[PDB]
């Protein structure tokens, strides 16, 4: 065994099976702990008459002879921590009238003999936790008059009998956490004076114990995880000088108006979940409180004298309760955090936050704050975090917020004006309701929750100059050629064949699409380089709605008219139905109209992009409307394709051949130009494929009106029917 010069022999871990021999005659300490000692024979310590610290923890000690510890009249500490020791040795420890600390915790103690703890009077610390004790020892504890600390913590205790700790007069700390304590008689703590700490942390207490009223001086009370639900008034009348009350994580409903009253030394007061309490707590006399947290309950008012008292208050978290009016927070110079979430506060007055130096974090989210005074935050100097999300705002002040490092405004959809970045020079996290408001701050790097991206541009709506000119050319050619075809077809004012009427109707739909893209290009021209302010107004206004309706209606009408043209061509190949086809064309027009109008019925279809195109959609929505339209158009193309291949199958007349060829070319072009847009609309539904939003927007803008700008060119240049109609129009005008 390793020795030491200070008479502190350390034999821990040596693997000994008995008390070491050959040691010095007189020692003061002994550390035989990890050496496996099964039992202590009689007078195993007779060689050591001056030992004062014996540490027999660790080893699996099962038997101690009654005379083993005899002759140790100078022992001070005896630690039998991790042994077997099924019972407390009442005879072995008897006669040790000098020790002050006794550790018997990690043993599998199940019974305590009534004669235990006899003959020793200087004991001050006692460990009996982590055992299996069904009842609190009464007589053995009564044998100890000088005990200053006791831990009956992790036993199987069920109830505390009255007058259980009567003779423990000079007891300061009592731990009873983590057992099955269920009932405490009203006299269980009688005679237990100057007890500063009581720890009933994790027991099963349903009713609040009144026995604590028998403790005159008590600092820490720790009923933490119990079934306590109601705290009566005057629950702490007998403890005027308590500082810590732990009651977190137990089901509370009612707390009482004056439960925490006249507790001058109390520092914190955290209540959560007590939803049945109406009035604000009566905290008069409790002025040293430094942080009060209140539940989600039915508290509607705050006492105006909240800051007149509680001069040392550092944080208040009223939160989930329903507060309506905020008193003037003048004073409370030490207040740093104010949390008012999910309240019902209708406005912020100018004097509500007057003063409040050293106020760092302010949370006001989930309230009904429709008005904020211009100089509400002017006095706040060191304010850093501001959370006013989902507050139904309409205007936001700027003065006094220069020092903000985090601003939240997510849910204020009615707040639309841009926020200047000159006022907020220290932002590092920003959350604005609309993506157009954030790009004014660009990205010191500012992180904005709504990503600007490419589908919410604030510099140029169309993008590059090549795209701008392509869109301009498409609009011009579509409008002019569609108008020319419409005039040269409908100016005959004579018998109109079904094919010519259908060509005119498709030209009308393409003219409408040209009008849509002209609206888009005029918006881009008049908002060149400054789309940041225009985007919110455009998306929220009726201009985006009408543009989207025009686009959807024109596309759907063109598709349906092309289908009916295919059906008419098939019937003409088979073989007089002028009125029937006119009625069918009107039916197609009304179907296109209702399809275009459905987004107006639905919520926010056209607000996704400034292009006001619903079926080009993001990853998250994957809307039923767009998927149904894509599927309808796809199955429509399949139907017309298969019927026209059937027409070829039954067909291996020159005018008929020209008409069917022109219709086939229209079909082929329309299918080609609708395929990429449908592919990009279906792309978000699958996560495997990722396509850049800039390319998506460019392809959509270039291909969506392309059939509209292309069909009139085909009809004008490759159909002799147009030449005949032009000759007829020239004859009519001349």
């Amino acid at each position, epitope marked *: 065994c390793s020795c030491d010069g200070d008479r502190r022999v350390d034999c821990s871990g040596k693997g000994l099976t008995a008390v070491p021999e050959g040691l010095s005659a007189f020692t003061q300490a002994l550390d035989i702990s990890m050496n496996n000692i099964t039992q202590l024979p009689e007078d195993a310590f007779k060689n050591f008459p001056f030992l004062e610290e014996l540490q027999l923890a660790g080893n699996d000690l099962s038997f101690i002879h009654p005379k083993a510890l005899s002759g140790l009249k100078e022992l001070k500490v005896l630690t039998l921590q991790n042994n077997q020791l099924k019972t407390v040795p009442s005879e072995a420890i008897r006669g040790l009238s000098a020790l002050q600390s006794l550790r018997l915790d990690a043993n599998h103690i199940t019974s305590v003999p009534e004669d235990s703890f006899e003959g020793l009077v200087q004991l001050r*610390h006692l460990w009996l*936790d982590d055992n299996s004790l069904t009842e609190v020892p009464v007589h053995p504890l009564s044998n100890l008059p000088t005990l*200053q*600390a006791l*831990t009956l*913590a992790l036993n199987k205790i069920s109830s505390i009998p009255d007058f259980a700790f009567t003779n423990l007069s000079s007891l*300061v*700390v009592l*731990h009873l*956490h983590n057992n099955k304590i269920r009932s405490l008689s009203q006299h269980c703590f009688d005679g237990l004076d100057n007890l500063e*700490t009581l*720890d009933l*942390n994790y027991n099963n207490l349903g009713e609040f114990p009144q026995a604590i009223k028998a403790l005159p001086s008590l*600092k*820490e009370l*720790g009923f*933490h995880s119990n079934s306590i639900s109601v705290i009566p008034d005057g629950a702490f009348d007998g403890n005027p000088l308590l*500082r*810590t009350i*732990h009651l*977190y*994580d137990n089901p509370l409903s009612f707390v009482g108006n004056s439960a925490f009253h006249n507790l001058s030394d109390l*520092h*914190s007061l955290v209540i959560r979940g007590a939803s049945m309490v109406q009035q604000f707590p009566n905290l008069t006399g409790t002025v040293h409180l*430094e*942080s009060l947290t209140l539940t989600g309950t039915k508290i509607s008012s705050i006492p105006n004298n909240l800051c007149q008292e509680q001069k040392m208050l550092r944080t208040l978290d009223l939160s989930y309760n329903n507060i309506r009016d905020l008193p003037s927070f003048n004073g409370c110079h030490a207040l740093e955090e104010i949390s008012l979430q999910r309240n019902q506060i209708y406005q912020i007055k100018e004097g509500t936050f007057q003063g409040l130096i050293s106020l760092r974090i302010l949370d006001l989210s989930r309230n009904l704050i429709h008005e904020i005074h211009s100089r509400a935050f002017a006095t706040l100097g060191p304010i850093t975090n501001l959370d006013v999300s989902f507050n139904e705002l309409t205007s936001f002040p700027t003065e006094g917020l220069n020092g903000l490092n985090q601003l939240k405004l997510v849910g204020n959809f009615k707040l639309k004006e841009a926020l200047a970045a000159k006022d907020f020079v220290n932002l590092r996290s920003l959350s604005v309701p609309y993506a157009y408001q954030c790009c004014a701050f660009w990205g010191i790097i500012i992180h904005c929750t709504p990503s600007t991206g490419a589908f919410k541009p604030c510099e140029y709506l169309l993008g590059s100059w090549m795209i701008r000119l392509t869109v301009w050319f498409i609009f011009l050619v579509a409008l002019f050629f569609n108008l020319l075809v419409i005039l040269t077809t409908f100016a005959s004012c004579t018998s109109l064949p079904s094919s010519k009427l259908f060509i005119g109707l498709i030209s009308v739909s393409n003219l409408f699409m040209g009008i849509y893209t002209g609206i888009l290009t005029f918006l881009d021209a008049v908002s060149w380089g400054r789309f940041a302010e225009f985007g919110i107004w455009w998306e929220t206004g009726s201009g985006c709605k009408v543009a989207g309706f025009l686009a959807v209606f024109s596309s759907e009408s063109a598709i349906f008219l092309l289908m009916l043209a295919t059906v008419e061509r098939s019937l003409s190949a088979k073989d007089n139905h002028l009125k029937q086809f006119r009625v069918a064309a009107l039916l197609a027009f009304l179907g296109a109209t209702v399809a275009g109008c459905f987004p107006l019925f639905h919520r926010g279809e056209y607000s996704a992009s400034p292009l006001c195109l619903p079926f080009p959609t993001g990853e998250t929505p994957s809307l039923g409307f767009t998927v149904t339209l894509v599927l309808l158009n796809s199955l429509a193309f399949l139907l017309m394709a298969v019927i026209y291949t059937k027409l070829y199958c039954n067909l291996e007349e020159n005018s008929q051949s020209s008409m069917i060829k022109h219709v086939a070319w229209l079909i082929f072009t329309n299918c080609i130009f609708f395929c990429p847009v449908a592919f990009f609309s279906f792309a978000p539904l699958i996560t495997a494929i990722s396509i850049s939003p800039e390319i998506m927007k460019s392809v959509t803008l270039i291909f969506f009106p392309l059939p509209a700008c292309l069909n009139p060119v085909l009809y004008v240049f490759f159909n002799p029917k147009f030449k005949e109609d032009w000759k007829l129009l020239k004859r009519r005008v001349t």
Partner: nanobody
Amino acid sequence: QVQLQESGGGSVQAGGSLRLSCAASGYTYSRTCMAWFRQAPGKEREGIATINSDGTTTYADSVKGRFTISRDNAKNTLSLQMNSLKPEDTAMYYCAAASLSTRGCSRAEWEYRYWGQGTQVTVSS
């Protein structure tokens, strides 16, 4: 009642590592919150590291990932290891104990009953 006597720590240059120990001598209950508190010159005490009885650990944001608290209840000691000490870290350091609550121990100095004398840590840049 714990004496809670701490030692270790001294003048160390910036970027160094320093280890503080705190040995309890009195009651020495191994089932309570234990924490380290920093007292800046002219400022107030602020918690920097707390540990539960089980071993769950919380740190202050200024030292999170940079300090490490560890409790050895077999020898009844608490330890704080610091790496890459910035000149801002010069302060007085106190080890503090409290009553049992397995919740993440609050960093407020009023949650702790027993305090040490503190030890000086000077980080000269």
